[PDB]
């Protein structure tokens, strides 16, 4: 029941995500290794360097999402600035292993709740990250669903400083429609899976606020973010 346009959109997004992720994995040897003052700073550096790799992946993917380059440069910046943390959280949830209760980045960097704390994050942010990851795991999302949810997230008309919210909302719609059609085909008996997925976008907005509080807390400790992350996250 997918239309040709929908099938093409989905296959292209999944392929784009795969290709962008292959370029991130090539960057793995760069990151400061995971291990004392030196050790504490090394753990923090490791996490922020993984984040830089993630930001570069997100930018690379966004460029390949149909419609994104039709937006003005200022709106591209506004949307990605707000979306970045939320996409990172989706990608974090995607990498969660329930058996070990650990998250795996770049194939072989695996971290528990306590490792997140040792990297310099607050329990007020870590606990909701892991709750969100558990909730996402329950949905059993496939590559198509993750790709579509990310596209939907990017085209959020209500982000601060968006100049053309009407255009953004119009570009979002086909991805919402595609996800509706896809989920109705994949699980024709589970009608509540689709709304539960969209409710995760609601959770992401809350997590963005919790993340902003985390960023503020680092400022008081003056743990300084690298320039890319500072530009996107610091006030
Ligand atoms: C490399 C990836 C991203 N590329 C593509 O994925 C793909 N799309 C598919 C088009 C139809 N397509 C199909 N999809 C689902 C089904 C569903 C079932 O099995 O019934 C059956 C088929 Cl044939 C195969 C390839 C491409 C393409 C589209 C149009 C013209 C030329 C290439 S591309 O190279 O840009
Ligand atoms: C503010 C500084 C301290 N913060 C951070 O430094 C950071 N680092 C992580 C960013 C996401 N992350 C990723 N790494 C690699 C990839 C690429 C792949 O694994 O293929 C994908 C992801 Cl999501 C791990 C490190 C954060 C974070 C952690 C969990 C969820 C969301 C954000 S934070 O914002 O608290
Ligand atoms: C606030 C200012 C300093 N900030 C920034 O300047 C900027 N850089 C932009 C440069 C790369 N990127 C793009 N540029 C051009 C194009 C257009 C084409 O390629 O033809 C398409 C894209 Cl995605 C978007 C973000 C940011 C950014 C970086 C990564 C992720 C999200 C936001 S920020 O908000 O910290």
Residue numbers in the entry: 219 to 253, 260 to 459
Q: Could you pull the original sentences from the published paper?
A:
The liver X receptors (LXRs) alpha (LXRα, NR1H3) and beta (LXRβ, NR1H2) are members of the nuclear hormone receptor (NHR) superfamily of transcription factors that function as heterodimers with the retinoid X receptor (RXR) and activate or repress gene expression in response to binding of cholesterol derivatives or synthetic ligands. Transcriptional responses of LXRs are known to directly result from ligand-induced conformational changes in the receptor: similarly to other NHRs, in the absence of ligands or in the presence of antagonists, LXRs form complexes with corepressors, while binding of agonist ligands forces the C-terminal helix H12 of the receptor to fold into the active state that creates an activation function-2 (AF-2) coactivator-binding surface. Reaching isoform selectivity by rational structure-based drug design has proven to be difficult since the ligand-binding pockets (LBPs) of LXRα and LXRβ are virtually identical. Since the adverse lipogenic effects are considered to be largely driven by LXRα23,28, drug discovery efforts have focused on developing LXRβ-selective compounds.
These compounds have a central cyclic sulfone amide scaffold with lipophilic substituents on both sides identical to AZ876, except for the tert-butyl substituent replaced by a propyl group in AZ1–3 and AZ6. The third substituent from the core is a larger elongated amine linker that is different in AZ1–6. The amine linker is mostly lipophilic with a polar group at the far end. The compounds AZ1, AZ3, and BMS-852927 have the highest affinities of 2, 4, and 3 nM, and the compounds AZ6, AZ7, and 24,25EC have the lowest affinities of 161, 105, and 133 nM, respectively. Analysis of crystal structures of LXRβ LBD in complex with WAY-254011, AZ3, AZ6, and AZ8, as well as of previously published crystal structures of LXRβ31,40,55 reveals that GW3965 and BMS-852927 are the only compounds not forming a direct hydrogen bond with LXRβ His435 and therefore they do not stabilize the His435–Trp457 activation switch crucial for the agonistic conformation of H12. Overall, most of the selected compounds displayed similar differential HDX patterns with a strong protection from deuterium exchange observed for the peptides lining the LBP: central part of H3, H5, β-sheet, and helices H6, H7, and H10/11.
